[PDB]
Design a protein around this motif. Structure first.
Motif, PDB file in Angstrom:
ATOM      1  N   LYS A  94     -17.344   5.933  -1.784  1.00 38.05           N
ATOM      2  CA  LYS A  94     -16.964   4.558  -1.554  1.00 38.05           C
ATOM      3  C   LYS A  94     -15.834   4.249  -2.540  1.00 38.05           C
ATOM      4  O   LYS A  94     -14.708   3.936  -2.132  1.00 38.05           O
ATOM      5  N   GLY A 103     -20.729  -6.007  -3.373  1.00 31.83           N
ATOM      6  CA  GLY A 103     -20.888  -4.573  -3.545  1.00 31.83           C
ATOM      7  C   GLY A 103     -20.943  -3.813  -2.224  1.00 31.83           C
ATOM      8  O   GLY A 103     -20.397  -4.241  -1.225  1.00 31.83           O
ATOM      9  N   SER A 104     -21.626  -2.677  -2.203  1.00 27.55           N
ATOM     10  CA  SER A 104     -21.698  -1.888  -0.985  1.00 27.55           C
ATOM     11  C   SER A 104     -22.938  -2.174  -0.156  1.00 27.55           C
ATOM     12  O   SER A 104     -23.867  -2.818  -0.627  1.00 27.55           O
ATOM     13  N   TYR A 105     -22.958  -1.698   1.085  1.00 23.73           N
ATOM     14  CA  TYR A 105     -24.100  -1.986   1.960  1.00 23.73           C
ATOM     15  C   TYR A 105     -24.996  -0.823   2.337  1.00 23.73           C
ATOM     16  O   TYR A 105     -25.944  -1.013   3.089  1.00 23.73           O
ATOM     17  N   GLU A 126     -16.887  -2.891  -7.854  1.00 26.56           N
ATOM     18  CA  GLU A 126     -16.266  -2.471  -6.611  1.00 26.56           C
ATOM     19  C   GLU A 126     -14.833  -2.997  -6.615  1.00 26.56           C
ATOM     20  O   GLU A 126     -14.588  -4.148  -6.973  1.00 26.56           O
TER      21      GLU A 126
HETATM   22 CA   LIG Z   1     -18.134  -5.006  -0.621  1.00 24.21          CA
END
Ligand SMILES: [Ca+2]
Ligand SMILES: CCCCCCCC/C=C/CCCCCCCC(=O)O[C@H](COC(=O)CCCCCCCCCCC)COP(=O)(O)OCCN
Ligand SMILES: CCCCCCCC/C=C\CCCCCCCC(=O)O[C@H](COC(=O)CCCCCCCCCCC)COP(=O)(O)OCCN
Ligand code: HEM
Ligand code: HEM
Ligand SMILES: CCCCCCCCO[C@@H]1O[C@H](CO)[C@@H](O)[C@H](O)[C@H]1O
Ligand SMILES: CCCCCCCCO[C@@H]1O[C@H](CO)[C@@H](O)[C@H](O)[C@H]1O
Ligand SMILES: CCCCCCCCO[C@@H]1O[C@H](CO)[C@@H](O)[C@H](O)[C@H]1O
Ligand SMILES: CCCCCCCc1cc(O)c2ccccc2[n+]1[O-]
Ligand SMILES: [Zn+2]
Length: 754
Positions: A329, A75-77, A406
């Motif tokens: 994103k 996923g995202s950070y 994602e």
């Molecule tokens: Ca990622």
């Protein structure tokens, strides 16, 4: 029987590897962590149901939180990793419960140790799909439940919007994939579940469902033996095949051979080159990708800005309101694949007539129709994601909103129109190429390879449909990677490659025979490692330990094709020179050469910097991943699309109006900016974040607290220099694309003959 052995090898390679993948796909489905029908207390009180877990997961997708933080490292950070974060709370609670933060070190020591021996034992009954967890654990589930209510109500003190989850977003009851029950207790339940399997030993095994991931002493999660052994083994096997492949490469001259003698460079009089209505029409396709590339980059600029100013864009407001991080994103990823992918579909449209020898009837019609189809899909799917994440959608979030994965953020009905678009695209290519396939005797020749690969485009995306809201996380992730790692890179490492071989054979720069043999060798080593190599994404997403060996070994072999690059770029640089300063395709080759060098540096070295299972154990889901992600994605695929985009624009613009001065500037600016953001920011932050996890636990590296350290922030702040430099390179391209429609030529032949 022209290239029979090469065919046996390629076919056999595809066959064997596909089996291994499927077998391993099966072992995952069969060995992934379970979702019990009922999880309950020692009193027999049910707290969770397979339906709750499926719902929590569902709201997590519903609110596109995978475009903010991660779960199981994917996923995202910007946000944290809910698995590691939820695991801490749940572990901390167990400590308090048995603690009945003030105890002695000699004392906290004993308790800690107690929660360890108690939480890592699997209390799930296979005979009866129900799991029971001790009180010490139920108290923990409470703290987790409270924790996230506060989070999804008050916020997380960093980038997350206040009270983003609200019942009013979905019907009273009879809610699509989420269960009849408070939504933010389902989430806490979903997060708790992932946290449960990440810390609970597999049945009979000695490590957990995620091979002891995430790293976290208090839960007994430490590096597995497999992680270290396969780090060494994978590289030794790679050293072994580098030799073997090198030998095969050298002994069979499995590369393209110049088709011209010294000083006998072929003449490229683009002015007397047949041009058709569908080609000129495919020309404007490129200015739009050039435009999508522009917006995509901007969203990137925005995301990078948010690490420094979490809830605002330079004081302004609507921006963080309409365009928050998770939403931005999503678009950044969606537009990346959209503009790059789309660039090659257009390239397909463009060469199609050339392969056939004429303009298919109604081609321009079909082309033009395909055009307004994507334009809808894009504008449309994006609108959907906004409405979906925000809640202005009902049970239509999955069909029209944000699917919550994602890289796969569009809604299913949006995905359906996507495949049809490609299917249509395929038809358009086939219509123009059809006769080529007929003239080409050798069924494994250039045109056949060009057509077989072209069809994998639409076909391969269909595996995404094996994914939907109630699928087990690990199993759904398994399929998600078929699209991220096999598909996206199938569009580019096979279709694109054969398309270039075709172009170089057409320009009469390399012999056709030489080229198809080359493609066979590449495809076999490319699929021979990459298909199974998909596994390095399964090291810690909950898949069985077998994937650590399979993934580590085959992804490392992916480097082999990559080293026969810095030297392929040279052969290209070489023939670019064999053509004087009047060589029509200078810009194209500059981007071609770059694609190759970034393939060695971006995918090759930066990708390998995080490939070892021993390293990934700490790194998985951190800044080094995006470091590699950009170096590879933009460095390889972006440059490649641009090379092909400029190639077409050259066959469409009137020579006299062309000037690759601006393109040199773009190439320089794009390359420097890319390297700059990777080296100046992503790399150094990545090292700190990996160090931080190694010493305090992965949860500490994923907390907003880490992003707040001054050192991190300064590193984050200076990214603006190279990000701007990159931005400049892309606008120069945009400006060159736009003011290119003002000097277009018009079709030479209609439904005629070249
Ligand atoms: Ca990622
Ligand atoms: C973490 C580190 C990551 C490093 C990534 C490195 C990526 C390397 C990128 C290379 C770009 C290659 C572009 C084509 C090079 C070959 C053709 C060529 O350069 O012809 C040039 C003009 O090139 C051109 O005008 C093309 C533009 C060249 C701009 C290169 C900028 C790359 C900087 C990389 C280091 C920051 C003519 O002038 P010359 O100096 O005589 O050419 C010889 C030098 N190659
Ligand atoms: C888990 C999945 C992993 C990825 C798998 C898909 C990868 C897709 C990307 C590239 C695939 C390229 C495949 C090329 C195979 C070529 C084999 C081949 O042509 O063998 C030929 C016959 O082929 C034939 O008679 C036709 C058979 C070969 C083509 C069939 C269609 C394949 C479509 C694949 C994409 C959906 C042998 O005979 P020929 O030389 O053609 O005929 C006589 C010539 N003198
Ligand atoms: C001005 C230039 C750019 C900037 C400032 C930028 C910035 C960012 C930021 C801040 C993220 C956040 C990842 C996270 O925390 O979850 C990201 C992710 C990503 N970017 Fe960009 N980006 C830029 C250009 C590009 C280009 C040109 C491409 C290629 C077409 C690209 C592909 C990606 C991908 C694939 C990811 C996801 C990787 C991951 O999550 O690990 N970016 N970018
Ligand atoms: C041009 C080819 C390649 C591209 C475009 C590419 C792209 C990417 C992207 C965008 C991500 C981020 C995925 C996410 O958002 O979670 C990623 C992750 C990763 N890539 Fe690649 N990659 C390429 C080649 C390679 C190679 C050759 C290796 C082998 C050394 C490799 C190893 C990895 C690993 C291990 C991760 C996982 C990071 C983590 O779990 O934290 N890649 N890649
Ligand atoms: C993965 C590596 C596959 C290598 C396949 C090599 C197939 C070589 O094939 C051989 O090539 C020679 C010319 O070099 C021809 O003269 C031979 O007749 C032919 O059988
Ligand atoms: C270099 C690559 C070595 C791969 C070795 C794979 C060994 C797979 O081994 C199999 O794993 C399954 C679970 O995935 C188990 O259910 C089977 O019982 C076991 O035999
Ligand atoms: C992101 C900004 C893109 C700007 C693109 C500007 C393109 C200008 O384009 C130019 O406009 C002139 C009229 O003003 C015409 O006479 C020229 O023929 C045309 O090329
Ligand atoms: C429409 C959104 C445009 C973005 C404007 C912000 C400009 C900008 C661009 C960047 O790449 C940055 C990188 C790191 C830190 C801050 C950054 N800022 O502020
Ligand atoms: Zn991969």
């Amino acid at each position: 029987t022209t290239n029979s052995f090469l065919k046996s090898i390629l076919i056999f390679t595809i066959l064997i590897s596909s089996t291994v993948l499927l077998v391993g796909g099966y072992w995952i489905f069969k060995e992934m962590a379970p979702r019990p029908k009922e999880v309950r207390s020692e009193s027999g009180e049910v707290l969770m149901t397979k339906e709750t877990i499926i719902g929590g997961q569902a709201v997590f997708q519903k609110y596109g939180l995978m475009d903010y933080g991660t779960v199981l490292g994917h996923g995202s950070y910007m946000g944290p990793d809910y698995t590691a974060e939820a695991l801490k709370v749940y572990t901390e609670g167990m400590q308090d419960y048995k603690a009945k933060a003030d105890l002695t070190d000699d004392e906290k020591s004993i308790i800690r140790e107690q929660v360890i021996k108690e939480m890592r034992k699997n209390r799930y009954n296979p005979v009866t799909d129900v799991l029971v967890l001790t009180d010490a654990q139920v108290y923990g589930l409470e703290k987790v439940r409270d924790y996230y209510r506060d989070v999804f109500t008050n916020g997380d003190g960093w980038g997350l919007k206040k009270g983003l989850i609200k019942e009013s977003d979905m019907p009273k009851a009879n809610r699509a994939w989420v269960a009849d029950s408070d939504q933010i207790q389902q989430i806490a339940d979903f997060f708790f579940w992932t946290a449960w399997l990440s810390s609970t030993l597999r049945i009979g095994d000695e490590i957990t469902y995620t091979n002891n991931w995430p790293y976290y002493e208090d839960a007994g999660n430490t590096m597995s033996f497999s992680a270290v052994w396969w780090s060494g083994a994978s590289v030794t096997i790679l050293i072994l095949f580098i030799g073997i492949i090198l030998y095969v490469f050298y002994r069979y001259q499995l590369s393209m051979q110049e088709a011209y003698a010294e000083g006998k460079f072929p003449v490229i009089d683009l002015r007397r080159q047949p041009l058709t209505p569908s080609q000129v029409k495919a020309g404007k396709y490129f200015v739009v990708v050039s435009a999508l590339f522009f917006v995509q980059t901007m969203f990137g600029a925005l995301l990078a800005h948010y690490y420094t100013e979490p809830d605002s864009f330079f004081g302004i407001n609507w921006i963080y309101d309409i365009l928050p991080f998770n939403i931005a994103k999503g678009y950044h990823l969606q537009l990346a694949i959209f503009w790059i992918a789309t660039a090659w579909l257009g390239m397909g449209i463009f060469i199609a007539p050339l392969v056939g020898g004429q303009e298919p009837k109604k081609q321009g019609l079909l082309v033009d129709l395909l055009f307004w189809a994507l334009v809808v899909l894009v504008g449309g799917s994006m609108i959907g994601q906004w409405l979906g994440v925000n809640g202005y959608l009902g049970n239509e979030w999955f069909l029209l909103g944000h699917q919550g994965w994602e890289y796969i953020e569009l809604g299913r009905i949006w995905q359906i129109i996507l495949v049809v678009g490609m299917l249509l695209w395929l038809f358009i290519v086939f219509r123009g190429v059809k006769r080529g396939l007929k003239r080409e005797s050798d069924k494994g020749g250039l045109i056949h390879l060009l057509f077989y690969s072209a069809i994998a485009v639409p076909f391969f995306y269909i595996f995404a449909f094996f994914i939907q809201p109630d699928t087990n996380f690990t199993m759904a992730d398994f399929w998600r990677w078929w699209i991220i790692h096999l598909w996206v890179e199938g569009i580019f490492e096979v279709f694109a490659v054969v398309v270039i071989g075709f172009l170089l054979v057409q320009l009469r720069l390399v012999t056709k025979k030489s080229t198809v043999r080359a493609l066979y060798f590449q495809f076999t080593i490319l699929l021979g490692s990459g298909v199974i190599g998909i596994g390095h994404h399964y090291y810690y997403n909950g898949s069985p330990e077998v994937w650590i060996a399979l993934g580590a070994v085959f992804s490392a072999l992916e480097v082999i094709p990559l080293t026969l690059l810095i030297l392929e770029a040279y052969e290209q640089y070489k023939m670019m020179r064999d053509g004087g300063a009047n060589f029509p395709y200078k810009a194209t080759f500059w981007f071609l050469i770059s694609t190759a060098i970034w393939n060695l540096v971006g995918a090759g070295v930066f990708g390998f910097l995080i490939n070892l299972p021993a390293v990934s154990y700490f790194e998985h889901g951190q800044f080094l991943t995006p470091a590699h992600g950009h170096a590879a994605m933009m460095g390889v695929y972006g440059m490649f699309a641009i090379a092909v985009l400029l190639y077409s624009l050259r066959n469409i613009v009137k020579p006299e109006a062309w000037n690759d001065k601006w393109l040199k500037f773009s190439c320089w600016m794009l390359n420097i900016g890319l390297a700059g953001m990777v080296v100046i920011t992503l790399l150094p932050v990545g090292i700190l974040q990996m160090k931080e996890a190694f010493i305090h636990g992965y949860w500490a590296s994923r907390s907003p607290s880490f992003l707040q350290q001054d050192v991190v922030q300064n590193l984050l702040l200076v990214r603006a220099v190279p990000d701007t430099i990159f931005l400049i390179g892309v606008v120069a391209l945009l400006v060159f694309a736009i003011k290119a429609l003002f000097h277009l030529r018009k079709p030479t032949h209609g439904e005629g003959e070249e």
